[model samples]
Target: RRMYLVSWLNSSGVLPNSWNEGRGNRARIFDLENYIRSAEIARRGRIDAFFLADQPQLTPNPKVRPEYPFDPIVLAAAITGRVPDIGGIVTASTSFSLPYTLARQIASVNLLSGGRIGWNAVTTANPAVAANYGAAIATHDNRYERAEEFLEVVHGLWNSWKFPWDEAIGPNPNPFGEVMPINHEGKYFKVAGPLNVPLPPYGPPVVVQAGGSDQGKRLASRFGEIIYAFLGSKPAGRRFVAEARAAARAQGRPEGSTLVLPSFVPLIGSTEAEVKRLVAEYEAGLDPAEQRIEALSKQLGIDLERINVDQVLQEKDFNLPKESATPIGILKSMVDVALDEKLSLRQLALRMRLIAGTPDQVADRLIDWWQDEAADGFVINAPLLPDALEIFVDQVVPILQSRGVFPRSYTESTLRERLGLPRNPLG
Candidate 1:
């Protein structure tokens, strides 16, 4: 089977300085045209999906970068309405949402998009997000537990409505679908719902999960059709997939039931000299010391200022507090990479996995990972917007297609079919 690929819209490019002035083609991140153009480029590349990463309640310093201001689900809906072929994966919070309403919103979007949609479930962890809800941040386990129940109820509600002839319909009112309530009373929610919206043609949107904690992995194994991963090395990726598969097996899912697409940031250039120049340009803008120290302190609940920046970090440095304001998986992934790479605190602070080279070189790295079973595919996180994406589609994608590693054109209509995922059973 051809490898799967997704492209991140990367509203603010992957770099901290991506939004800094003088990086030409700097479209306003809040502009709808930017997303349409990005989605169109992904469609042109024959990428399976265009991903929108969301931090619902995040309010980044405008001086540092532009905020991810739009609601991802709504943004995705708008994007699909303009760029037709590519699928959209929108992030939404399981922690802060009602299962019934979220189910309806997503179902309507799925239908509106002709099933070219996916839901990337996240347990909102940013303290600001909880503040938006006027509640204290829940413990990591508590959040995941609520998420598990939340998903169950959502899935149940999706299957509650049935068409008159869905099974055998000799009766109907206005040919409307049959409505039956999912009498769900769980630890976190009680929703008696037969979703008001009709079930989409492909049923629920594909479940795309991005979590690396133990509970997160369990949730992914149980429900994720597409597992979005972040890995710094091939060996790390191998272990990640192996463990994920084992967990999925424990859930009685067959081998290859879920696909892992690692988050990849590629810095591509026409030539090696160009690549070197590109790297220099971007690296010139990095001011990691102060920013990293502050972010680390806030997210990890550590006083990183006392640590020597030049010293290589070890397991002792990260005494994870009883709670974190961000997803534990993200912090853990950084630590895993830091230890694996034996990186100095300075390097760990950068926390970016980037591959820089000419087009063929970049393609070779991707093929190497795929061939070595380290990844099923990748979600391209372009370091710069539109232009980086355009270059990749025009340059790298052709090499992959010619090498028979990726498809030349999309072969399926629905997002699930495009990703080779089977229809999820109705709730």
Candidate 2:
């Protein structure tokens, strides 16, 4: 199994008080120098990639305040010069960026990174972000609709032109020098001919999607090489993996080609009790009003003040919006687990934390999940930023490698190869 580490490049001084302590300054960077230093450490640790999660705007709420907001692509490009080997992931919203422009930028990065670039496709989730872009907030499902067309246009742009040298009848032709232009017109975009840059080594950056809604899954199956999900348990993870794989196969993707990587925030320790203690300690540092109870209430759509914390949460209380209630969905699965197990609100939240295990034990469970068809890999969610990632790399990764569950060292150079995916072909 393969694992990738996705970083938000979250500034330490800027994070809400509700998150973990001891992350102060570690995540905060004064400039590109600090960012480069951090990238070097991540590369030295043998991480497959460093992903940058970005948004057009930061929505301010009672729980948090906006701090440093840097563009993820600009940051990713800077890091590419610093660490050439690690794959660079940039999050760009399809709704905001034009297909032609996005294609050129990502293809350039692919060349810069030697085909080690990944584009995380997203539809802007926050309504506030739409206002900034001078557009009305789209209906949730409608955003996915636009995204589908957006991807079609972008993919067409990527494959627009073929090497003229390859098409020419003459021998010893110059493939790189002769360019074949592409003329494309689509529902969302139209372009005259070939891309500004040569086609990238892998054709284009690998496409990753983090949609968990039914529509989201459908779109992912069609275009995603890596589907990012959040699973609360082994059983839940297994069901998700199975469903996603089936969806991909039904959509004409080769069987087992689409990799399902669920996100996790492991709170590691030496013993089970110690791990529990560590998790409690981290949670103890969080401000319940800002981070836990209040945030959970909004996310689960329940009023914490009205409900008894100890009382089991009934299914009726957790109604999901139509956009979120997919045929095989993330929110719906959580609701099912809560009702089936008769879990209290507190138990439900704790279960979501991915805590309560020693480093070795956590590794064992992760391997079990992979073996049992629960997941193809994992996307480590850094709940504590540098601190959590540092600990995970130093401890859990070694155990996983020793067990033959993960590669001790990378065998492939490009991100697609590392993920056991083929380079995309231009059509």
Candidate 3:
């Protein structure tokens, strides 16, 4: 059976003024307490982990707007004491953070959770966010390049202490043992000696990466234990899976060690027509032109209002060059999906609407995708925040469990064990 992880924050916005106001806010759909309750439900259903997607700066949008932003790590810290078994995967970007700070924070979380923390490693692409941090925007590939070095430094920092507490104790032994600490100096980072925190129960928490570009794939292969991907079609997803696995092999990782998980957004109903109606109702609320323009402008980092909606884009039409064209490619894929589905320009913006299906239909499609090597696992995107998660957990999880495709209960104590990933060595 394959393991699955789901995000806790169903919507994009964070840090609501009142818990009720936050939950009721159409833009940001999660109440922290409600989200925690939902996670407990998922954990009971044997879901692998509850991932928290985050952004340092809020990217404004119409359907969802961010009134306030809070750190996911801090939120995870609050949840750690409540949930003992489920893994808490927090998003921490490499682009704007210092390695030592990230290392210390994540190490602290691991200790607090007793070995149930995972880092969703991301090299953020938002130029606005870069400007906010007082750093110049890097070219897309260059971001990955820096991320490679960043991972190395963070890993080194995690390994600074030589498995603290592994030494044998006796009645007159020295108070401090003979374990030698690390002294690392590198091109991008330098540290004198041991980390301030003790070694975590799981050593270093699992490092998961979500980068889909060629350079991104190379970096992930070198350092990622879990690779998260996004694709609108099965063929594209399969290609991504194959390419990522090949890259990991090239980097000398053992076969089957690197897991490939693609994003799946499910809109479930008892019947197919009901599901279709539900999706249409949700999408009807969105303005097509506004959504398309917003997505294109935000993703391409260019003003889309200047371009004609009817204009068919080619590779050369992009303002950003190939080295920094990932956002353009992502936008192009959205357009391609619209074209393939024979949807009009207005309909193109509603591509996310196509993810709706009956619970049985959803299960069947997911099973097919998993079996066909399109993805090893899934990261679900909730279209309606807590309601979406509630629907899936309440409706779809049991069906999956009965079919022998998912676990009926958690077999392992820690998130690493639940995901079947080996813990990092203490030294």
Candidate maximizing TM-score? 1
Reference-based TM-score of each model = 0.83, 0.80, 0.80
Global CA lDDT of candidate 1, please?
Answer: 0.79
Q: Say which prediction, candidate 2 or candidate 3, comes out ahead on lDDT.
A: 2
Any runs in candidate 3 off by more than 4 Å, and if so which? 8-31, 59-63, 164-181, 288-354, 425-427
Query: What is the C-alpha local distance difference test score of each model?
Result: 0.79, 0.69, 0.68
Q: Model 2, which residues run further than 4 Å from truth?
A: 1-9, 13-15, 18-23, 60-68, 162-181, 271-277, 285-347, 354-356, 425-427
Candidate 1 root-mean-square deviation in Å: 5.5
The candidate scoring highest on lDDT is: 1
* Clash-forming residue pairs, model 2: 12-28, 182-193, 182-194
- The number of clashing residue pairs in model 3 is 0
User: What is candidate 1's lDDT per residue for 1-427, written digit by digit as tens?
Assistant: 6778898885766665666543544457778987787888889889989888888666566555554768988899889888887898988899888788899888888878888988999998799888988887899999899989988998888788865545345555547666789888877798988888777555577888998788999899888888988756678898888888788878887566788988878889999899879866766676554775666655654446666767787777776655666667667767777787687665665545477779999888789888877899999988777778889999999999999999887778888778777676322
